[PDB]
Design a protein around this ligand. Sequence first.
Ligand code: CA
Length: 217
Amino acid sequence: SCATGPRNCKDLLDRGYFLSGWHTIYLPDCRPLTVLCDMDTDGGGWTVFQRRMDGSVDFYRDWAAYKQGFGSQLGEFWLGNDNIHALTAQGSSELRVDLVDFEGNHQFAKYKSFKVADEAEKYKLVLGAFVGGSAGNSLTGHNNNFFSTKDQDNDVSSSNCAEKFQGAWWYADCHASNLNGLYLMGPHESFANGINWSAAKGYKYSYKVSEMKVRPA
Ligand SMILES: [Ca+2]
């Protein structure tokens, strides 16, 4: 129950769950949620809120879809903005982004803190210092931006970034990263509308794998 249950994947790691997989955690208001724990990468204890791997799931979705979450525990998913807010509300959480290209290269980026606000604040990103990683830094430029989807434009562009770049993100005008973009399978001719992390592979290369995950700082 909520009284003794784990709050996140680090609690689960501490209790001896050493394999990655789906486990029940209890959010701050006691709402139970099934989450994916990455117990392997970089010490383990990471709660995964976004996964792309094969293009099986459509990510070009509306506000309601991103709010509640969508996809599959067996594959690709977005955990949901209400869930991500709740998970990052208590304490301080570090963010790790893991990427794999189509050539087999693994790259990563790490940030010292990560929070998303509530729906009233349009799931605004509150991002701490870049730590490092082979992927470089394509998220700091998104700090303090609201989340936007195709049907709800909260970006700082005269354009509709989510529609123009075919994703959903804390778009500014418009992006350095676009991990909820189209699954375009490596090099693409269209500009900046793929699973792009521009500090590493630029605006015309879409990654094979994306994983976004959090753990107590
Ligand atoms: Ca706009």
